[PDB]
């Protein structure tokens, strides 16, 4: 989120806040360039290692002075703080070579892997002073500008990009031998795989912008989450279509196919906008509002899938189609395992994310934005195992009916 804070020092506000999770031996450069003046400048900076997760991210910029008044007499805050209040007589003297050196720690090189907070207050003694010195706050760790909050997601997306690359190679290796036996579901699954390709490719490019150039582009994040929303929407659309048995039950569903794609479009029009809200860091009211129709939609759509699945299971039980019955029985078992794993992951992660008074284990929050993608990737792998090409796949996949 723009770790190189290019904030020009204004007259409207005098307090800058920077609260993240940082590597040990991370340095915080401050770059000061501006039109030199003659004003007395008192720069006070604070670097505090808040041991708890809550006192930095639930912390808001409104209570910066309240956090200061808590820290001065040690109310409600735990950890060690480091500070200096070096004074500058003239504005020009700030521009001159004043390479920062840390003074003394009271119980700017970082001392541990922890969530830190960084507060700068600039005492002035107006319109020109508004946005005069472009203060560039540059955080620089051992692995360049990347932070622990964003660190394991990057290597995780390395790994899962490798996973989909292997998936695409395997899919093409399967499709190379046989082409005349391919039906529309094969092209649709290939499309889902390629959507995963493009989505995780642009998202990885976004993290590459984060680590090398150190800048955040919101449009790439919009594109990535929009692609993911379209991808999972089309995936569950395929699940619903298969659960109704296209061709096996009815050659063309028609108006019910229109209602299926309308259900998919409604799911998009809610959940994709929800994901776009997650991109921009939606406020607490919008965040609380967003997931109610989302959760209701997941419950309703999944229940409809189970109803359709049991119904087509009964019909195929009447049909006495042996190998198809075995394959779709494995499909139902996969769906049961997927739903159970997903719901237990939801309960564990979401409940223990907020019920506990202090998230004291900061290291394992990269799983939260990763477990859904891991589950869905495993689901895609199982589906590709079930739908592997073969010589008798012409009779195995579909029968004239």
Numbering used by the authors: 38 to 144, 174 to 191, 199 to 474
Quote the original article.
TMEM87s are eukaryotic transmembrane proteins with two members (TMEM87A and TMEM87B) in humans.
Cryo-EM was used to determine the structure of TMEM87A to a nominal resolution of 4.7 Å, with better resolved regions reaching ~4.3 Å in the core of the protein. The second, between C89 and C431, tethers the bottom of the extracellular domain to the top of the 7TM domain in the H6–H7 linker, perhaps constraining their relative movement. In TMEM87A, helix 8 turns back towards the center of the protein and packs against the bottom of the transmembrane domain. The position of helix 8 in TMEM87A would sterically clash with putative G-protein or arrestin binding through interfaces analogous to those observed in GPCR structures. In TMEM87A, this cavity measures approximately 8,637 Å as compared to 12,350 Å for the WLS cavity. H5 and H6 are splayed apart to open a large ‘slot’ between the cavity and the upper leaflet of the bilayer.
